[PDB]
Amino acid sequence: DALMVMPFSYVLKFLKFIDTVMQNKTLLHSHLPLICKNLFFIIKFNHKELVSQKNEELKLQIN
Amino acid sequence: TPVTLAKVIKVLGRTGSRGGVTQVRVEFLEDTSRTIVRNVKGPVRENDILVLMESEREARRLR
Protein backbone atom coordinates (compact mmCIF):
# COMPACT_ATOMS: atom_id res chain seq x y z
CA ASP A 1 0.00 0.00 0.00
CA ALA A 2 2.94 2.30 0.66
CA LEU A 3 4.24 1.73 -2.86
CA MET A 4 0.85 2.25 -4.47
CA VAL A 5 0.01 5.51 -2.68
CA MET A 6 2.86 7.50 -4.21
CA PRO A 7 2.28 9.21 -7.58
CA PHE A 8 4.44 9.02 -10.64
CA SER A 9 6.68 11.94 -9.70
CA TYR A 10 7.62 9.92 -6.66
CA VAL A 11 8.06 6.84 -8.82
CA LEU A 12 10.55 8.84 -10.88
CA LYS A 13 12.48 10.01 -7.87
CA PHE A 14 12.34 6.48 -6.45
CA LEU A 15 14.09 5.36 -9.62
CA LYS A 16 16.56 8.16 -8.97
CA PHE A 17 17.10 6.71 -5.50
CA ILE A 18 17.77 3.25 -6.93
CA ASP A 19 20.15 4.73 -9.50
CA THR A 20 21.98 6.53 -6.71
CA VAL A 21 22.12 3.48 -4.48
CA MET A 22 23.62 1.04 -6.97
CA GLN A 23 26.92 2.84 -6.99
CA ASN A 24 27.48 2.47 -3.25
CA LYS A 25 27.91 -1.27 -3.32
CA THR A 26 27.93 -1.75 0.44
CA LEU A 27 24.25 -0.85 0.77
CA LEU A 28 23.30 -2.24 -2.56
CA HIS A 29 24.52 -5.65 -1.49
CA SER A 30 23.23 -5.41 2.04
CA HIS A 31 19.72 -4.64 0.78
CA LEU A 32 19.51 -6.49 -2.54
CA PRO A 33 16.23 -8.39 -2.03
CA LEU A 34 14.42 -5.43 -0.49
CA ILE A 35 15.60 -3.23 -3.37
CA CYS A 36 14.61 -5.91 -5.88
CA LYS A 37 11.14 -6.42 -4.39
CA ASN A 38 10.34 -2.72 -4.21
CA LEU A 39 11.73 -1.75 -7.61
CA PHE A 40 10.12 -4.66 -9.43
CA PHE A 41 6.75 -3.95 -7.86
CA ILE A 42 7.05 -0.21 -8.59
CA ILE A 43 7.78 -0.55 -12.27
CA LYS A 44 5.35 -3.45 -12.60
CA PHE A 45 2.63 -1.25 -11.17
CA ASN A 46 3.48 1.98 -13.02
CA HIS A 47 4.46 0.10 -16.18
CA LYS A 48 1.72 1.64 -18.31
CA GLU A 49 2.98 5.15 -17.59
CA LEU A 50 6.69 4.32 -17.38
CA VAL A 51 6.95 3.03 -20.94
CA SER A 52 5.08 6.05 -22.27
CA GLN A 53 7.44 8.53 -20.66
CA LYS A 54 9.72 9.84 -23.40
CA ASN A 55 13.09 10.86 -22.03
CA GLU A 56 16.47 9.38 -22.77
CA GLU A 57 17.62 10.21 -19.24
CA LEU A 58 15.07 7.84 -17.77
CA LYS A 59 15.92 5.30 -20.47
CA LEU A 60 19.60 5.37 -19.52
CA GLN A 61 18.65 5.28 -15.85
CA ILE A 62 16.62 2.11 -16.33
CA ASN A 63 19.46 0.60 -18.38
CA THR B 1 -11.62 27.22 -18.36
CA PRO B 2 -11.94 23.65 -19.63
CA VAL B 3 -12.56 20.51 -17.60
CA THR B 4 -11.05 17.06 -17.87
CA LEU B 5 -12.22 13.48 -17.54
CA ALA B 6 -10.33 10.81 -15.64
CA LYS B 7 -11.03 7.09 -15.38
CA VAL B 8 -10.22 5.52 -12.02
CA ILE B 9 -7.73 2.66 -12.32
CA LYS B 10 -7.18 1.85 -8.63
CA VAL B 11 -9.23 2.50 -5.51
CA LEU B 12 -6.45 3.23 -3.06
CA GLY B 13 -6.91 1.39 0.19
CA ARG B 14 -4.97 1.52 3.46
CA THR B 15 -4.41 5.25 3.18
CA GLY B 16 -5.17 6.97 6.43
CA SER B 17 -7.87 9.12 4.92
CA ARG B 18 -10.74 10.94 6.54
CA GLY B 19 -13.95 8.93 6.53
CA GLY B 20 -16.17 9.54 3.54
CA VAL B 21 -13.15 10.62 1.48
CA THR B 22 -11.34 7.91 -0.44
CA GLN B 23 -8.06 8.45 -2.20
CA VAL B 24 -7.97 7.17 -5.73
CA ARG B 25 -5.62 6.86 -8.69
CA VAL B 26 -7.17 8.24 -11.85
CA GLU B 27 -5.76 8.33 -15.35
CA PHE B 28 -6.79 10.71 -18.06
CA LEU B 29 -8.79 9.93 -21.17
CA GLU B 30 -7.28 12.39 -23.62
CA ASP B 31 -3.79 10.99 -23.16
CA THR B 32 -4.48 7.50 -21.89
CA SER B 33 -1.18 7.16 -20.03
CA ARG B 34 -0.66 9.89 -17.42
CA THR B 35 -2.10 9.45 -13.94
CA ILE B 36 -2.77 11.53 -10.84
CA VAL B 37 -3.78 10.60 -7.31
CA ARG B 38 -7.00 12.37 -6.40
CA ASN B 39 -9.43 11.86 -3.56
CA VAL B 40 -13.16 11.62 -4.12
CA LYS B 41 -16.20 11.99 -1.87
CA GLY B 42 -18.87 9.71 -3.27
CA PRO B 43 -19.10 5.95 -3.55
CA VAL B 44 -16.45 5.26 -6.16
CA ARG B 45 -15.22 2.07 -7.78
CA GLU B 46 -12.73 1.06 -10.44
CA ASN B 47 -13.08 2.28 -14.08
CA ASP B 48 -15.68 4.94 -13.45
CA ILE B 49 -15.00 8.36 -14.89
CA LEU B 50 -14.79 11.50 -12.82
CA VAL B 51 -14.64 15.10 -13.90
CA LEU B 52 -11.58 16.93 -12.61
CA MET B 53 -11.74 20.69 -12.72
CA GLU B 54 -7.97 21.02 -12.81
CA SER B 55 -5.38 18.42 -13.66
CA GLU B 56 -2.43 19.93 -11.81
CA ARG B 57 -2.74 19.06 -8.12
CA GLU B 58 -1.91 15.71 -6.58
CA ALA B 59 -3.81 14.87 -3.44
CA ARG B 60 -2.48 14.53 0.07
CA ARG B 61 -4.14 12.80 2.98
CA LEU B 62 -7.05 14.51 4.68
CA ARG B 63 -7.36 13.52 8.40
Binding site: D1, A2, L3, M4, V5, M6, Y10 | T15, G16
Partner: peptide, 11 residues
Protein backbone atom coordinates in the same frame (compact mmCIF):
# COMPACT_ATOMS: atom_id res chain seq x y z
CA UNK C 1 1.91 11.13 13.03
CA UNK C 2 2.03 10.10 9.39
CA UNK C 3 1.94 6.56 8.08
CA UNK C 4 3.84 4.45 5.61
CA UNK C 5 3.68 5.62 2.07
CA UNK C 6 3.66 9.26 3.02
CA UNK C 7 6.68 8.83 5.28
CA UNK C 8 8.36 7.26 2.27
CA UNK C 9 7.14 10.10 0.07
CA UNK C 10 8.47 12.83 2.33
CA UNK C 11 11.76 10.98 2.80
Amino acid sequence: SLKAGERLMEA
